[PDB]
Amino acid sequence: NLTPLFEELLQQCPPGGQNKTAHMVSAYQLAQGNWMPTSCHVFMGTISARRTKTHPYEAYVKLRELVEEHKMKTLCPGSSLGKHNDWIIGKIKYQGNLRTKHMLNPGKVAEQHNVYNKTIGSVMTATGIRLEKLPVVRAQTDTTNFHQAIRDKIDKEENLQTPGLHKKLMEVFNALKRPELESSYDAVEWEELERGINRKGAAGFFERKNIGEILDSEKNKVEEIIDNLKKGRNIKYYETAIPKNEKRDVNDDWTAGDFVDEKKPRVIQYPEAKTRLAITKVMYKWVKQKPVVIPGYEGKTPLFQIFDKVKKEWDQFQNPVAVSFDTKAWDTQVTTKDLELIKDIQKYYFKKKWHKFIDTLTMHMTEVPVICADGEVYIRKGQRGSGQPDTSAGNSMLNVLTMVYAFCEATGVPYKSFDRVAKIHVCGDDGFLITERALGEKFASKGVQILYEAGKPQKITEGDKMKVAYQFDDIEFCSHTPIQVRWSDNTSSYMPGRNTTTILAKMATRLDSRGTIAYEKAVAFSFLLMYSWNPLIRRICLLVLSTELQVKPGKSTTYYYEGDPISAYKEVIGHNLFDLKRTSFEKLAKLNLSMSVLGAWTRHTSKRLLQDCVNMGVKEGNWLVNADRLVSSKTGNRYIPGEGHTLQGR
């Protein structure tokens, strides 16, 4: 009768190991009665008890008491600052006001805009879209709330994990390794590194130069860092903490969409540019996943291809479901033991000569001095700094390993049999697995407690059950969800869907210090490659791309086109924009609801936007807008593309 109160309490219990020498009882058995708990240390949702004719509610107060004693005995031990971190105390000037209760705040070192895209935003307002009703995106955070986010998210002890967990995860990894690559990775040349790197990658708190300036002038400083790490010598490793969307919140690398920024923590933490180059030059093959050795890693997968790729798998099951990975604030849940596990996997693939390098870097990452923009210093215990070069690889491998383990331990499938039973996909902590429905439902109901014990608590959901998709287009991944379209050649395919209100908001605004038609047409094109299923988005893009046919698109955003944008679309999408005859009617109604709830459009909006495209397309000539099938069928005019190619930006 009171079994949900016990499932709750078992998620506040310290994770323990298998006690095969006493009775290990589930939350169900406890809600029955005549079971008296003898310790609060939980293992696969079970604790140690002895039958002793006790009332069920009596046994709850005892578990609650054992939990409350255990917490007031592991409070907050003042931890020894490692010697290799001592230098930061030598930079302290004033005393701290972070008021951290779980990490050292050893003081404070000396002190050291959302705007509209004018053309895109005009096209929206002309057809009656109310911009001030759209959701705000890319919000900045002041210093008072910045320090509060530190206190809320970062200022915590390392998660307790199941004893022996990381040996199991290494067992899972042994079922997934690629032995033809073992001990084979070496550092890359400067030239290869310089190809794939944003030269405006941010400088650390004590750095003045950005990535490109350091490449042009201080390569010796980077090789000096590499040398010291190679031999096992400490470096002055620190990370800098800035709020999301700050000036220094810059991606070293091309991102597959704005969803990567959306998923960043509120507190961004990154090593120095010199230090980031050092790690990247040596660990390139691992951090960039070249080749991909993480199963199901979609980090390199274009957003316009991902769901077609997944549907292929979904079709091979006889009753597939998809179970979502939904860890709470993943980066704050990464433990020292997690990092050492990833250190061990890296050592598998890297040549022996880099193992001391990896050991020493990993040691620096387990206790990280972090300097805030305003000078406040805290000493982070474990966790992931979002700007670390290893964030995508290191999180993706840890996510895969932890999710396979949790799935296998809930269902009974041996680790070496996971690949005959389920398919997995990850982007850092984001992802899901597809499997047959009964396995999927099993995993979904037991995964929450197994994942809490493995140190990755899940977001608190309706009945402590992991989210299950029972139809393909209910999957969520990379902030998007599948939507089917119909082409004029009697085929169908999937595109990345999301709320129309969200797309408008992201398309309409930017953070700027770059505000010009060149940038906006690059945005319009980048969005057309993803959202051409959405007729409102499709037509705003065509209108924007019709502006100043002689100005070329900018290269600072996700994609751009060389030559004809309509032909560039067909190059990567595989059909002509003109061949899209139908978007799935049910899914589109779902993704359009918030337009009506927020009042971001009116009953005329679609008509006015269609009427604007028609008015432009009837005129004699060659008009981009006539690539829209319904516009062309009303103007009587077709568009004849010239040559054109899609490319990545920066």
Numbering used by the authors: 13 to 124, 132 to 532, 536 to 672
Quote the study that presented this structure, word for word.
Compared to the RdRPs of other Flaviviridae representatives such as the NS5 of the Japanese encephalitis virus (JEV) and dengue virus (DENV) in the Flavivirus genus and the NS5B of the hepatitis C virus (HCV) of the Hepacivirus genus, the pestivirus NS5B contains a unique ∼90-residue N-terminal domain (NTD) that does not have notable sequence homology to any other viral or host proteins. The global conformation of our CSFV NS5B structures is consistent with the recently reported CSFV structure with an RMSD value of 0.9 Å (95% coverage) between the reported structure and our representative C-682 structure. These structures together reveal that the NTD adopts a globular α/β fold with an α-β-α-β-β-α pattern. The NTD interacts with the palm of the RdRP core intra-molecularly with a mixture of hydrophobic and hydrogen bonding interactions. Collectively, these biochemical data indicated that the RNA synthesis fidelity of CSFV NS5B is fine-tuned by its NTD through the intra-molecular interactions with the RdRP palm.
